[PDB]
Amino acid sequence: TLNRYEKIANDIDAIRGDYENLSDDALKHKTIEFKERLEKGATTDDLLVEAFAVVREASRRVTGMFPFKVQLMGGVALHDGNIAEMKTGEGKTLTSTLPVYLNALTGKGVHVVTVNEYLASRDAEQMGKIFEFLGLTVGLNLNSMSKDEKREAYAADITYSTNNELGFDYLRDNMVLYKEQMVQRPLHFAVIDEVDSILIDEARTPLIISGQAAKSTKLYVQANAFVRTLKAEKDYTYDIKTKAVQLTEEGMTKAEKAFGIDNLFDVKHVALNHHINQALKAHVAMQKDVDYVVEDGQVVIVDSFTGRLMKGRRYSEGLHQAIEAKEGLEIQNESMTLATITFQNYFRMYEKLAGMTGTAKTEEEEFRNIYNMQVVTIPTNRPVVRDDRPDLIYRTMEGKFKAVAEDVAQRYMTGQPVLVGTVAVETSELISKLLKNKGIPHQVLNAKNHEREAQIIEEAGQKGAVTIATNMAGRGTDIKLGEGVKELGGLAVVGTERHESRRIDNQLRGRSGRQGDPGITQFYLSMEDELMRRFGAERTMAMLDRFGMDDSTPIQSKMVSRAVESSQKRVEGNNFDSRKQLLQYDDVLRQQREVIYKQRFEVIDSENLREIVENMIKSSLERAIAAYTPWKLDGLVDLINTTYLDEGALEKSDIFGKEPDEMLELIMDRIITKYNEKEEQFGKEQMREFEKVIVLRAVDSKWMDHIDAMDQLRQGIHLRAYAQTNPLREYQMEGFAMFEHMIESIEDEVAKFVMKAE
Numbered sequence: 001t002l003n004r005y006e007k008i009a010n011d012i013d014a015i016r017g018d019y020e021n022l023s024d025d026a027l028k029h030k031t032i033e034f035k036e037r038l039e040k041g042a043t044t045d046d047l048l049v050e051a052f053a054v055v056r057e058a059s060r061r062v063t064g065m066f067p068f069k070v071q072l073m074g075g076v077a078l079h080d081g082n083i084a085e086m087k088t089g090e091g092k093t094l095t096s097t098l099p100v101y102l103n104a105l106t107g108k109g110v111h112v113v114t115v116n117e118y119l120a121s122r123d124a125e126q127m128g129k130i131f132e133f134l135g136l137t138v139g140l141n142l143n144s145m146s147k148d149e150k151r152e153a154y155a156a157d158i159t160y161s162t163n164n165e166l167g168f169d170y171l172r173d174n175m176v177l178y179k180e181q182m183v184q185r186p187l188h189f190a191v192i193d194e195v196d197s198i199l200i201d202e203a204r205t206p207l208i209i210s211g212q213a214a215k216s217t218k219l220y221v222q223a224n225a226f227v228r229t230l231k232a233e234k235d236y237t238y239d240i241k242t243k244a245v246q247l248t249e250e251g252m253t254k255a256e257k258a259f260g261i262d263n264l265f266d267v268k269h270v271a272l273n274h275h276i277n278q279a280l281k282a283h284v285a286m287q288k289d290v291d292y293v294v295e296d297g298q299v300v301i302v303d304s305f306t307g308r309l310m311k312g313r314r315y316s317e318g319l320h321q322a323i324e325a326k327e328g329l330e331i332q333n334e335s336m337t338l339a340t341i342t343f344q345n346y347f348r349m350y351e352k353l354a355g356m357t358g359t360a361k362t363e364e365e366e367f368r369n370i371y372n373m374q375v376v377t378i379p380t381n382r383p384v385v386r387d388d389r390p391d392l393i394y395r396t397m398e399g400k401f402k403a404v405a406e407d408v409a410q411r412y413m414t415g416q417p418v419l420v421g422t423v424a425v426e427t428s429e430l431i432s433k434l435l436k437n438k439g440i441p442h443q444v445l446n447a448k449n450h451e452r453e454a455q456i457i458e459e460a461g462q463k464g465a466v467t468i469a470t471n472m473a474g475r476g477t478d479i480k481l482g483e484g485v486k487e488l489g490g491l492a493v494v495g496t497e498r499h500e501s502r503r504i505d506n507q508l509r510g511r512s513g514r515q516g517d518p519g520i521t522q523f524y525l526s527m528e529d530e531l532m533r534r535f536g537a538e539r540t541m542a543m544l545d546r547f548g549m550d551d552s553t554p555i556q557s558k559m560v561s562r563a564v565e566s567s568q569k570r571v572e573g574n575n576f577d578s579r580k581q582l583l584q585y586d587d588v589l590r591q592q593r594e595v596i597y598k599q600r601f602e603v604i605d606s607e608n609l610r611e612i613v614e615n616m617i618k619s620s621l622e623r624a625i626a627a628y629t630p631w632k633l634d635g636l637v638d639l640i641n642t643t644y645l646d647e648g649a650l651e652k653s654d655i656f657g658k659e660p661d662e663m664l665e666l667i668m669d670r671i672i673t674k675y676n677e678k679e680e681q682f683g684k685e686q687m688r689e690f691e692k693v694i695v696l697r698a699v700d701s702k703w704m705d706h707i708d709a710m711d712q713l714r715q716g717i718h719l720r721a722y723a724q725t726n727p728l729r730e731y732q733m734e735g736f737a738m739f740e741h742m743i744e745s746i747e748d749e750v751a752k753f754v755m756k757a758e
């Protein structure tokens, strides 16, 4: 009858007497024991049962908490590299402590990660005490800390950190000038609290490191000036199929003549082409004083309604600057990206991955597809008696909010604590105001000060408490019921709307009814709601409209509530399909980053840089030979003198009559002797430094240009097929060629500089 996780739970509960009656020292020793056993054969799995019991016993002694059996089940699923779905209040923090210890024994490190520094720091100091008791070191990585400090934190057996810091740290480690400046060790094991926020909602969120130089605007003015000379039908068309303004065949020929290009679509010209396309979208697609407006010397997006009158927001993909160039305004600069990674791409590098959260089931497929991780749903310790009521539907938001306030006021008069969840600050203010008019004391949490938020939330289950929380403000702080609150029905949770994703709704819902407590949840919606403007959602509302529904006769039916849930499943499914497709595109740059980072590390880790540099030189020399050896017009000889050697070093006299590979051996042998002489004049150690500064400069600067070009390639890929074949293959192929071209640039730059400078 009993399953794998239940069995192991019992195993650990059976041998509890074995650790129950040990002094602290004999108990702490178990850590040394386990280690001795590991290094001489035993696998981490072999020890799970005992190690878990040790932690289990140690927590009771330092915290007073003794992990429940469900917490033991969750612990196993985490060890297995899966996702433990454990409802809010099941004690995920203490639960994580089991697999973290086990997986830290081999001394390879474990990153424990959350959404903000308040939480990482709270959990570190609280769970740290258990680990330090077991003779383990615990580090805390924070944004305000120095390199040396970060290095120490990462050198601990266990490291707590935010996901942002881990990602930034990793990027900076790939920008260093010496190996020793790195702060991270290899990525061993990450256990991710709030795993759905981090691995799903932020899956594609890019972390970026910018340079301090301003991106040049030359291309913007060049493109703008070329576009002005264009003629309206001779040179361009609004393509119905692609929904865009494109150059005609004549326009491309004209652009190719105007600059010095053979083929405008060639990958080496992606930037030129894209700027031209934007300046073309800005000049004939964006009507001035219609699409946008100019305030002073700035440009503002109207937006339909405008709705956005003077928003501070701007158009993406260089479109904004293309308009500024058109409008003769100042081109507002943006710094260049030196390094980038998304969280999906970052966490995919760990040897092992695990995660825990209250809400993962609705994303089961997403975790499997993207991360190849199972969602293991762990039973609650106590039955869930919380009453989750079908949605209430109103005709107008005005009506909905009025009902929300009245609900809150009623529950307040009884003393029953109330938690109100909203999706936006403006809604929060709106509800708060309504409550002030009724004379109802309450607190507002606008997701700003995490530390203050947790203090308020700690108190939100006391008699007479009323708390308004915008977007899961104060997440990660359990809300306990005060004296006599059980008797009052527990925490009442009112949601003032539903998110596009049901998962986010469930997070709010789960804040009530913890550890078997009674409680009630109720969501409110209206015809005018944003979510209620969808395909299958709006139809239902349209009918209720015709039926004769009123703000004074809200609908509350199982059918309609299910219609809402189903419509959210459908939308989730669309989002998941888009995410799937975006991921495949992301993978092209992801793989290129891995190849170039490995090559860059090779450079700073290299015993002698000679071999790496020589190969670059030769590889580059071979391309010079081929370009002249399709009688042969050398040509090549003259070029060689100004690139790898000295004036008149090579000879016309050698011109020649030899097989090309023969020439390579001969010319490379001449290069090697010149190189040898340079090294002798520099001294070898000073030659290494010199080569290193050159190679890293070549790599760092061509990588930066490449990120910029790849981004432009992607933004405009829908114009490079050939619709409606799928552009993914076109992007992969062009991405591949552009990367090769980048590698070739790096090689040429290095070769020229070490040979010809200084």
Ligand SMILES: Nc1ncnc2c1ncn2[C@@H]1O[C@H](COP(=O)(O)OP(=O)(O)O)[C@@H](O)[C@H]1O
Pocket: 065, 066, 067, 068, 071, 086, 087, 088, 089, 090, 091, 092, 093, 094, 476, 477, 478
């Ligand atoms: N085995 C246990 N015995 C008693 N209390 C526990 C146990 N495990 C966790 N708790 C407490 O229950 C509350 C829930 O903790 P937390 O880990 O934040 O829950 P969540 O799983 O929602 O993150 C905390 O106050 C924690 O100290």
Ligand SMILES: [Mg+2]
Pocket: 092, 093, 193, 476
């Ligand atoms: Mg937690």
